[PDB]
C-alpha cells in the first residue's frame with residue numbers, strides 16, 4: 001500500500017477507530033506516522049485539535065489527505081516506541097528514568113491545559129518516545145476543549161481506560177477536566193515505579209482502591225515504591241478532585257525536584 005508520495009511500511013498500532021502506519025517518503029526517505037481512518041463529527045473535531053498542537057512533548061501534526069472514504073492523519077514519528085514497552089512487568093523502571101519521563105509528561109499536560117485541551121486518555125500506550133528518549137503525548141481522538149474564551153466547561157462524557165480513570169468520572173454527573181488528567185498521570189507514575197496497576201477501577205467495589213484509601217501502603221504496588229515518590233502519589237491519587245494536587249503544586253513536590261542519577 002501507499003499514499004501519494006509515502007509508502008506504508010509497518011503497522012505501529014490500532015485503536016477504537018483506525019490503525020497507525022509508518023510511512024517512508026519515496027523521494028526524500030523521511031519517515032512519518034499516518035492514522036488511517038475508515039468512514040464523522042469526531043474526525044472533524046480531532047483534526048481541529050491536532051492543528052492547534054505545537055509543543056516538544058506533544059505529537060506534531062503535519063496535515064491530512066482525503067481519498068474517498070479513507071483519511072490520512074500525518075503525525076510526527078516517535079522512533080523510540082511507547083513508554084509501555086519501557087516498563088518491565090512487576091519491576092517498572094529505574095527511578096531517574098521515571099522522574100525524567102514524568103517531568104516531560106507534566107510539560108505536555110501543562111501545555112494542553114494552557115491551550116484549553118484535555119487529552120482524556122493518558123496511559124503508557126499513548127505516551128510515545130522519540131530517538132533522544134523524549135516523551136510525546138499522542139492520540140487526540142478522545143481530546144476535548146474544556147476552556148474556550150477563558151471560560152471553563154465541565155465534562156460529563158465517560159471516557160478513558162478504567163485503571164487510569166479518576167473516581168469522579170464514575171460518581172459525578174459533571175466534573176472538572178484538569179484533575180482527571182492529573183489522576184491518570186499518577187497511575188502512569190505508579191506503573192513506571194512498580195510495573196503494576198494498583199486497581200482495575202477506582203470504585204467502591206474495588207478492594208485494592210479501598211485499601212489505598214485506608215493508607216495500607218504495606219501492600220503492592222506501593223511497597224515497591226520509595227517514600228519520596230510515594231508521598232507525591234499520596235497527593236495525586238486523592239478521591240476529592242478539589243482536594244487533589246494541581247500541576248503547579250506537583251512542580252513544588254520534594255521528589256519532583258530531587259536530583260536522581262542512573
Ligand SMILES: O[C@H]1COC[C@H]1N1CC[C@@H](c2cc3nc(Nc4cnn([C@@H]5CC5(F)F)c4Cl)ncc3cc2Cl)[C@H](F)C1
Nearest residue numbers: 012013014015020033076077078079080081125126138139
Ligand atoms: O496502543 C493503542 C491502544 O491504546 C493506544 C493506542 N495507540 C495510540 C498511539 C498510536 C500512535 C502510534 C505511533 N507510533 C509511533 N512510533 C512507533 C510505535 N511503535 N514503534 C515501533 C516499536 C518500535 F519503536 F520499533 C514506533 Cl517507531 N509514532 C507515532 C505514533 C502516533 C500514534 Cl497516534 C498507536 F498506533 C495506537
